[PDB]
Amino acid sequence: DIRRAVSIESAIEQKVVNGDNVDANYSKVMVEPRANMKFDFPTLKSYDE
Protein backbone atom coordinates (compact mmCIF):
# COMPACT_ATOMS: atom_id res chain seq x y z
CA ASP A 1 0.00 0.00 0.00
CA ILE A 2 2.75 2.52 0.69
CA ARG A 3 4.49 1.77 -2.58
CA ARG A 4 1.09 2.25 -4.19
CA ALA A 5 0.19 5.50 -2.43
CA VAL A 6 3.61 7.14 -2.74
CA SER A 7 3.53 6.28 -6.43
CA ILE A 8 0.09 7.85 -6.76
CA GLU A 9 1.24 10.96 -4.92
CA SER A 10 4.37 11.44 -7.00
CA ALA A 11 2.34 10.82 -10.14
CA ILE A 12 -0.19 13.52 -9.29
CA GLU A 13 2.54 15.87 -8.09
CA GLN A 14 4.17 15.61 -11.50
CA LYS A 15 0.78 15.93 -13.19
CA VAL A 16 0.38 19.25 -11.38
CA VAL A 17 3.88 20.64 -11.85
CA ASN A 18 4.36 19.49 -15.44
CA GLY A 19 0.68 20.15 -15.99
CA ASP A 20 -1.93 17.70 -17.20
CA ASN A 21 -1.20 18.54 -20.84
CA VAL A 22 2.02 16.56 -21.34
CA ASP A 23 1.33 13.63 -19.00
CA ALA A 24 -1.19 12.27 -21.51
CA ASN A 25 1.66 12.28 -24.03
CA TYR A 26 3.67 9.95 -21.77
CA SER A 27 0.95 7.34 -22.08
CA LYS A 28 1.71 5.79 -25.44
CA VAL A 29 -1.02 5.85 -28.06
CA MET A 30 -1.76 2.15 -28.22
CA VAL A 31 -3.23 0.56 -31.34
CA GLU A 32 -6.75 -0.77 -31.33
CA PRO A 33 -7.10 -3.97 -33.40
CA ARG A 34 -9.66 -4.56 -36.13
CA ALA A 35 -10.85 -7.70 -37.86
CA ASN A 36 -9.24 -8.51 -41.19
CA MET A 37 -11.71 -10.83 -42.88
CA LYS A 38 -10.04 -11.73 -46.13
CA PHE A 39 -11.14 -14.45 -48.42
CA ASP A 40 -7.77 -16.04 -49.00
CA PHE A 41 -8.03 -18.64 -51.73
CA PRO A 42 -5.89 -21.66 -50.80
CA THR A 43 -2.26 -20.67 -50.95
CA LEU A 44 -0.53 -21.60 -54.19
CA LYS A 45 2.91 -23.06 -53.78
CA SER A 46 5.50 -22.29 -56.40
CA TYR A 47 5.80 -24.51 -59.44
CA ASP A 48 9.30 -25.89 -58.90
CA GLU A 49 8.27 -26.38 -55.30
Interface residues with other proteins (CB under 8 A) are 25, 28-39
Q: Least Å distance between CB 31 and other proteins?
A: 4
CA distances from 32 to 28, 29, 35, 37 (A): 12, 9, 10, 16
> How long, in residues, is the chain?
49
Q: Least Å distance between CB 3 and other proteins?
A: 25
Q: Least Å distance between CB 7 and other proteins?
A: 22
> Are 23 and 15 contacting, i.e. CB atoms less than 8 angstroms apart?
yes
Judged by beta carbon, residue 5 or residue 44, the one nearer other proteins is: 44
